[model samples]
Target: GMTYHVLVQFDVPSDKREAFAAAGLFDANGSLQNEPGTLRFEVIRDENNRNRFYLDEVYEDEAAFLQHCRNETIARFYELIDSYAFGPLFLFKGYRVEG
Candidate 1:
């Protein structure tokens, strides 16, 4: 299996920040369970930009990504986010060339 990387950016409300906070943990755990081959699943937020959240994801290969895409939890999570999120979900992709 080859390693793959992903970056996720999020935008939501400031007042309801705790909702996003709890979801962040749930989502990360769900992703790992739903995508066992995910080498890394990290959630990062900008302290200065409280509304900004990012997820740095790394997987073993395309199958890992595919599994994530088909996960029921992920599907439901997206639906919930669609109701409150303010912007498009941003995804940046790349691969590690060294280390």
Candidate 2:
């Protein structure tokens, strides 16, 4: 399995925050449904930074993640988020054995 630690750094207009989060939730749902390899994909908002968010994800393999990248719905959401997003979107990917 693979783990993904993501930090989404972006600023949303204060007035547009609720709408933006709703749209982001829609995009996240797409990944969960279409990406079979995703063991987990959760979104978190920073309490201090109203516009900042994070995505914690887990996938079965690199190929699965690659396929997810190609998913049309996810791609659409990516573009949607990009409109209001500027980053410093940090990502850490790693794996471990049960031992």
Candidate 3:
């Protein structure tokens, strides 16, 4: 019954890629350690575009997901990437239906 999900994609400048990636790992660890309802948190790199990255996450439900969205770590991540990112963060978020 747990179906909340979020997919985030963005591109960082070539020189910022390494630091951006490190922050991604830090954010993932924060989610896993602090958010009990955070079922999954994954950071993926685009093979062709090394500076591109994706964040795929699943949560227990809307409430849990909302909590994650409002977390400090995530907010810091946003601020940290503001300068390095090529554009706005693209987010695809919704509830998954499974029987």
The predictions' CA RMSDs to the true structure, in order, are 2.0, 2.6, 1.8
Q: lDDT by residue for model 2 over 7-94, one digit each (tens)? A: 3444577765776677667767887887777667776788888877666666777676667768886678667766665543656666
Off by over 4 Å in 3: none
lDDT of 3 by residue, 8-49 (tens): 887888899898888888889889998998988888999898
Off by over 4 Å in 2: 1-9, 96-99
User: Which portions of model 1 show Cα errors greater than 4 Å?
Assistant: none
What local distance difference test score does each model get? 0.75, 0.66, 0.84
Candidate 1: C-alpha RMSD to true structure equals 2.0
- Best-to-worst order by lDDT is 3, 1, 2
In candidate 2, list every pair of residues with a backbone clash.
Answer: none
Clashing pairs in 3: none
The superposed Cα distance between candidate 3 and the true structure at residue 28, in angstroms, equals 0.6
Please give the TM-score that candidate 1 achieves against the real structure. Answer: 0.83
